Design a protein around this motif. Structure first.
Motif, short mmCIF file in Angstrom:
data_model
loop_
_atom_site.label_atom_id
_atom_site.label_comp_id
_atom_site.label_asym_id
_atom_site.label_seq_id
_atom_site.Cartn_x
_atom_site.Cartn_y
_atom_site.Cartn_z
N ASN A 31 3.77 6.14 -5.48
CA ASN A 31 3.63 6.32 -6.91
C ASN A 31 2.33 7.01 -7.30
O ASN A 31 2.29 7.84 -8.24
N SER A 32 1.26 6.67 -6.58
CA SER A 32 -0.04 7.26 -6.85
C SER A 32 0.04 8.77 -6.71
O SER A 32 -0.48 9.47 -7.54
N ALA A 33 0.74 9.27 -5.69
CA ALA A 33 0.93 10.73 -5.56
C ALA A 33 1.52 11.45 -6.81
O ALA A 33 0.99 12.48 -7.27
N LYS A 34 2.62 10.93 -7.35
CA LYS A 34 3.27 11.56 -8.51
C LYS A 34 2.39 11.47 -9.77
O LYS A 34 2.21 12.46 -10.54
N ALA A 35 1.84 10.27 -9.96
CA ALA A 35 0.92 10.09 -11.07
C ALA A 35 -0.22 11.09 -10.94
O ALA A 35 -0.68 11.65 -11.93
N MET B 288 2.44 1.99 -3.36
CA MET B 288 1.31 2.38 -4.18
C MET B 288 0.92 3.82 -3.85
O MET B 288 0.51 4.56 -4.74
N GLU B 289 1.07 4.23 -2.59
CA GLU B 289 0.78 5.62 -2.23
C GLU B 289 1.86 6.56 -2.80
O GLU B 289 1.57 7.65 -3.33
N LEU C 119 0.82 -1.20 0.00
CA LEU C 119 0.00 0.00 0.00
C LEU C 119 0.86 1.26 0.00
O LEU C 119 0.55 2.22 -0.70
N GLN C 120 1.93 1.26 0.79
CA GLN C 120 2.80 2.43 0.90
C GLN C 120 3.45 2.85 -0.42
O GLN C 120 3.43 4.03 -0.78
#
Lengths: 95, 92
Positions: A7-11, A4-5, A1-2
């Motif tokens: 990478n999800s932020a930059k995306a 994923m968090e 999850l971390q």
């Protein structure tokens, strides 16, 4: 999850910059092109005043590069990520 | 470049949120229950439910029900190619 968090932020920075009809229109027009601000205003039919804020956002988040020639500012797409995303959107929605 | 950009923008607005994007990435090539999602995301089911409602409203996910379990999958070609791309770009 971390991770994923992480990478999800930059995306998401990228997605938030794209998720606006005018900013997306600009980005789509720049795909494989260098366009002046005058041309962008003409093609989008937005005054340069309204345009400048959209362009400012795209500059600030790194989606676009600039150069100056005489009294003309020329914009191009910047990152590998934005180019890939715009290519894809073009294929799904235009080409 | 006005109507299609508008459709695209609906998709991008749905994706432009860390939790919504996480949900979509997890659903790629998968079908997951609400419980599997909440478990992996560490969200309350009500919080998750807010995001899911947005994804269903805007056509990014399909649902189905078996017993009292709701299952999610990605919906369209567009959404799937966008998630696949993003996964390539940001999840090496």
């Amino acid at each position: 999850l971390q991770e994923m968090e992480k990478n999800s932020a930059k995306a998401v920075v990228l997605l938030k910059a794209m998720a606006n009809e005018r900013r997306l229109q600009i980005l789509c027009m720049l795909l494989d092109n260098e366009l002046s601000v005058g041309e962008l205003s003409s093609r989008l039919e937005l005054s340069q005043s309204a345009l400048s804020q959209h362009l400012a956002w795209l500059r600030r988040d790194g989606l676009v590069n600039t150069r100056k020639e005489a009294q003309t500012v020329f914009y191009t797409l910047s990152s590998t990520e934005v180019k890939a995303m715009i290519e894809l959107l073009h294929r799904l929605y235009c080409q």
